[PDB]
Amino acid sequence: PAVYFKEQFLDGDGWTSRWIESKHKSDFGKFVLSSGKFYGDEEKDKGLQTSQKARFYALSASFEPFSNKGQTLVVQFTVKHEQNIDCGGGYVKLFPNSLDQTDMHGDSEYNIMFGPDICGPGTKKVHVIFNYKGKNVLINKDIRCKDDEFTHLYTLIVRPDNTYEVKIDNSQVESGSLEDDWDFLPGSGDPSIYAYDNFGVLGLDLWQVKSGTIFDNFLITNDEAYAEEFGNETWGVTKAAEKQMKDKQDEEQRL
Amino acid sequence: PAVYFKEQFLDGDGWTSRWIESKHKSDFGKFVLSSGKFYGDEEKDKGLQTSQKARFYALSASFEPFSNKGQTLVVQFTVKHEQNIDCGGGYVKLFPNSLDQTDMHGDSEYNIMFGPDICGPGTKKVHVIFNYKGKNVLINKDIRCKDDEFTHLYTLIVRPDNTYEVKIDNSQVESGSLEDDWDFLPGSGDPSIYAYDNFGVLGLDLWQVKSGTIFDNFLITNDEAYAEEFGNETWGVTKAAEKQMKDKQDEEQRL
Amino acid sequence: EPAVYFKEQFLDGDGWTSRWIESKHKSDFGKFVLSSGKFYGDEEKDKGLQTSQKARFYALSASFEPFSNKGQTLVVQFTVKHEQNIDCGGGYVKLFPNSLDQTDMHGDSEYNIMFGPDICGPGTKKVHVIFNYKGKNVLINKDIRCKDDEFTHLYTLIVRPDNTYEVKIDNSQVESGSLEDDWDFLPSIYAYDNFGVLGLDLWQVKSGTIFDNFLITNDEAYAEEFGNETWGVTKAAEKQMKDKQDEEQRL
Amino acid sequence: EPAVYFKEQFLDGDGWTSRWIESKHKSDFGKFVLSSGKFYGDEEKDKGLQTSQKARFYALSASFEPFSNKGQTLVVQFTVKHEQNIDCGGGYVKLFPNSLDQTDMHGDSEYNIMFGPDICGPGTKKVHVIFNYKGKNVLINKDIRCKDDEFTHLYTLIVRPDNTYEVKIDNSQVESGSLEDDWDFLPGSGDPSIYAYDNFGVLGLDLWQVKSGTIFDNFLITNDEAYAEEFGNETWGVTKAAEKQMKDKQDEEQRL
Amino acid sequence: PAVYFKEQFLDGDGWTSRWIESKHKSDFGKFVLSSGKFYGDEEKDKGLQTSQKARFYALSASFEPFSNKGQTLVVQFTVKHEQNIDCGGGYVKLFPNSLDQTDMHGDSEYNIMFGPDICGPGTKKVHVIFNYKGKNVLINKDIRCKDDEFTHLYTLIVRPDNTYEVKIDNSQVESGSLEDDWDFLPSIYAYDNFGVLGLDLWQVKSGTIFDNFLITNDEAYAEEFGNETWGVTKAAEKQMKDKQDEEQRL
Ligand SMILES: [Ca+2]
Ligand SMILES: [Ca+2]
Ligand SMILES: [Ca+2]
Ligand SMILES: [Ca+2]
Ligand SMILES: [Ca+2]
């Protein structure tokens, strides 16, 4: 089982030597390390938290490059919109190793984008975007994302038969084939759409009105079963204690 | 969070000094340490396996005694009927510390009995039995147990307001109040039914026709959230890889 | 002639639920239940309020027609039974002014007097006698040992208008003196303009304590009578039933 | 674009009496009155809340639409004028959570932040900056001198989501730094959420005064530093020169 | 084995909720979490580092109180004077639970003080101090401490027969009986209550790192833990430092 990338932010400020802030603009919001006001475990549940309102963010982590050619690609992470978000992204981008991390921005060329996007009551959507022939192609299926304040697990699975699966909280919510669920081409044909020569950076590149979202437990792997295990060892261990602590705070607030 | 008992059989043959065979009869079947023919992890998934057909079994483990008076009691363990069982029990019993472990048998006085029981096409049931006023009182709700070959998590939660909950695979399948869901009394009124002065031994005391059932990951605790965590760190880590290995063996069999 | 300001024996089934009020100051207070426990002198008479949950704060109270002890003897009396062999927890009462909001009662609510047994581990087996004076809660300076076995014990506080006091356990004096000598107060120290509520407001690790036979009166002799009609009637049969259960346990 | 969470200039006659609430926690609180005092830049503009009684506690507060500073800059700003040449008394504000019962406000009510000048005798001329954290009221460890003459002075506190702060007097910086360094909150790096409060709903004047006569005016709670500075120049900055001129004239007449 | 206290600072900033700064003075030096310039493992070898020169320090950790009465008491921790110290303490103090951690200072009443003290070429000494009858009684044996830049394990063993042993780097350096090796005025060894471990000390050149604190009643367990901590640090630390010394020379 290949682990191309793992990040749990368990080693204090260690993460500040693994991630790079884009300088494309001077006024990007800053991520901070935090487990927020409630959590399952104060230390384990530390992740990157958006710290400023109405800002663009642009922070990224490089890893030893790889190709998903001939293989399964699994992209997984947790997202927690502690602040009860009104409008903002919670998605990740996988970039070719040719990306200059210090110049990353909204129009930098990525391979794949994946994850939750919220904007008002009307948009609660999971993006699955594939870059193909210089276009960023959006999935045609409507996948609802989570919108409460708790930690949710997001998983994208992409297979070399051009099938894909999306999971939320380790449970399937959408499935199918690339050729059907995106408009890449007028008719069937190109079995290589799923495949990228090179993956070298994972970026958080996004916009937020109300800030406070925490990203944790990032995993890039080629094994679906391992992804599921890791999901149960991370999200699955956070879940119940987080909910208990938050119920308790809600009750005290009410009094 | 109090952990009154935990057993995962992770330290080789260490378990043989924690569990005691009843000598009440000379012909009890024997438990053996085994992860069986398929598993998620050959080592982690070791547990106690029934090794002989058409036998009574009687093995138990003592722990520092406790009372659940004024507190939540959670009893949890995994069961795997690898052999595709026809008829046999998969339940545990919690006994007072006054039990002589070398004389344990079917008629020994327990406090609580909990878990799956299978007998032919008609019976796939989860027992929840409370000992009260010298009677063993059986739950009136019909709870279906699992019957496939895979590992399943069984959880009983008993609370000091006389509520209870039963979970399978970390997900609620039944809930209510002791006074409603058992015939202890003709009408309501004994709020202490849930409570026992002492718990000192967990026993596997049961009958099996076709043998091969594996018991693992026993937990007795006072914390529902911790039980759920441990469930996701045990069953939740076994699940996907176990299924994948077994599908592979089924496919090889078909050829 | 004796004035009875408050009496509670929990003799009329669930009648008590309309005389006592649960504080809602917090959402996770432990709950009292009506019970005579596993052993008793009389299954019905020895019903009282039992703490039902471990490691919890409790806050339950009862009102009565307000009164003042000014110019009078005040006697506060009740039974306490730590069935569970308590490790750490209170068994004391508090007398409050009628200005107390019973639905907001908690550890920091202002009381007039606090009285009764407090146990915490090997070191503490003590009877509290606390007087509220000049916005301070003043603790008795004498060391009074409380009972700690599993049986029912009678606790009695007597306060007199010459500022003398007496403490009794099981109807027998264990301590006495004057307010001015036995507390560090900043002449009617003893006196309160009004009493309107009795509260059980306390903490408990191991739960199972039973409170019964509460009495507030102005007559020492009557308190002693009532003690002998309640505790004194419980005592022997309770001990006998428990001895029998201990013997069966051993076999 | 700047958010204005609270503004009070007392420009609309007795209108303020429907925006502020007196605590009844005690029966003998001093009373605020509307006044521009004996000298002023403009008789009407410079009306504010004046302490009217000697040797008293005061407890008056105003609500606003609740907000959180989470992920944002918080600016708290107001003018203070100790006309009476104060001997001993507070001139500071408190920002409270919306859970405060205004009719029970007092010295021990739980606030989020306290900010402003405190004078007591020759030794104490100090600007308080207090943060409530983990049930403690933590006092700034830097020594900031307040103004003590009879004129109107502008007090501004700026708190930023990187846990930096700045204090200004008369629109000019007098102190700055980081929350982790300038208060004793906790060991190590610090806690990136210290600056942040889930909610702000009430501004209170809750304080003690020997010699009375202090006037509070031109309150502003905003999320924009630049706007705070503008408003400061449109209020204090417009009061300043005329106030000083009228007072010089009165001092000269007094001499003759 | 009873483990009354263990601290390895393995859980990021988790330690900031276990340790309390004294406010007795306003100008105490500040401890910072760090593995320094060289180490065996960047993560494991994080500990509390003194961060300022010519300062008093006063930081403490409470634990569930206990008594050593009728038992062995073992106090153990690692000390690394990375800065090549000129003058400064590297010792711990065990306090009764009656200590106000927010007022801890040099004159607070402790039960036992133990560990290295360096001041100039003349003083390289291991303190073992027992509080008895309101006096702080100093061991009368001369125990040399380590003074290089590397991580060293310090272990004090006190037994209910009034014997004691001192180890450096898991190897005995001193032993005897309380009655012979101190001038006390039979349970000298015993204290009713232990509730706080404090780092309360003075330092000229700063940079000392404390890690791997252990309070236990089992000598063998202390030795095991020493080998799993100091014993796992030692070789890789030395390797990394040799490499840095060579590069510095060129
Ligand atoms: Ca994490
Ligand atoms: Ca196992
Ligand atoms: Ca009764
Ligand atoms: Ca005005
Ligand atoms: Ca360490």
Residue numbers in the entry:
A (entry chain C), B (entry chain F): 19 to 207, 302 to 367
C (entry chain B): 18 to 203, 303 to 367
D (entry chain A): 18 to 207, 302 to 367
E (entry chain I): 19 to 203, 303 to 367
Sentences from the paper on this structure:
Similar to its ER membrane homologue calnexin (CNX) ectodomain, CRT is composed of a globular domain, into which a flexible arm-like P (proline-rich) domain is inserted. The globular domain is made up of seven concave and six convex β-sheets forming a legume lectin fold. We have investigated the CRTs of two distinct parasites, Trypanosoma cruzi (TcCRT) and Entamoeba histolytica (EhCRT), for which a pathogenic role has been proposed.
The residues of the conserved lectin site (analysed below in §3.3) do not participate in the packing interactions in this new crystal form. Compared with the previous native HsCRT structure, the largest deviation was observed for its N-terminal extension, which, in the absence of interaction with a neighbouring lectin site, is more flexible and found in different orientations up to Val21. The part of the junction and linker region (LPGSGD) which was not initially defined in the wild-type (wt) model has been rebuilt in most of the copies.
